[PDB]
Amino acid sequence: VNSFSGYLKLTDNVYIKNADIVEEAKKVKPTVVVNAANVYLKHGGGVAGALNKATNNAMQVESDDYIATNGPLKVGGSCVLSGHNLAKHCLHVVGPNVNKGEDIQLLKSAYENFNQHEVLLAPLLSAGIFGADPIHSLRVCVDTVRTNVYLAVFDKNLYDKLVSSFL
Numbered sequence: 001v002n003s004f005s006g007y008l009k010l011t012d013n014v015y016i017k018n019a020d021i022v023e024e025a026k027k028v029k030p031t032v033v034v035n036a037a038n039v040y041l042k043h044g045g046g047v048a049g050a051l052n053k054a055t056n057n058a059m060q061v062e063s064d065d066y067i068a069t070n071g072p073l074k075v076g077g078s079c080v081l082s083g084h085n086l087a088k089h090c091l092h093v094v095g096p097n098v099n100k101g102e103d104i105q106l107l108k109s110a111y112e113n114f115n116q117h118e119v120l121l122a123p124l125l126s127a128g129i130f131g132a133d134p135i136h137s138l139r140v141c142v143d144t145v146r147t148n149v150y151l152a153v154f155d156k157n158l159y160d161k162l163v164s165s166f167l
């Protein structure tokens, strides 16, 4: 048993909800919240900017120190950093950004990072302002992640479309 509530059941291990992921993280304080990061960990907008804002910019301060030491991530890669006031850990995962012209095939590699964690609260990688079709991202998630993933979809109208079209 875990503390996630009101999620629809898509598969044995994938659950989904219409929620603001920042507000969800605050309530649950999950072991792992996934950030939809870029390779520079520059948390300007989207999930990244919103989580970062909720940490009072402490996520960005930590991230800049990480990059100064380690250099950028790979598209498809990840790093584990603090979850600050939102979660124990934040898994920063870089999905391909279609609006930057990155290869959507890398989405599966991005979701494979989730398998290193038993339970996660996460967004649909590469969707939203990253430019991919959320229906596709959800399909790749279900077909790649084997650990227990609790997906938050910010937009109610898209959430209903994702549920109604899910095979």
Ligand SMILES: Nc1ccc(C(=O)O[C@H]2c3ccccc3C[C@@H]2C(=O)O)c(O)c1
Residues within 6 Å of the ligand: 020, 021, 022, 023, 036, 045, 046, 047, 048, 050, 123, 124, 125, 126, 127, 128, 129, 130, 152, 153, 154, 155
């Ligand atoms: N408080 C919040 C929470 C989330 C977002 C957001 O953009 O998230 C979308 C986002 C952003 C970037 C990549 C993928 C996704 C999917 C996610 C969604 O639409 O579910 C926001 O701007 C403010």
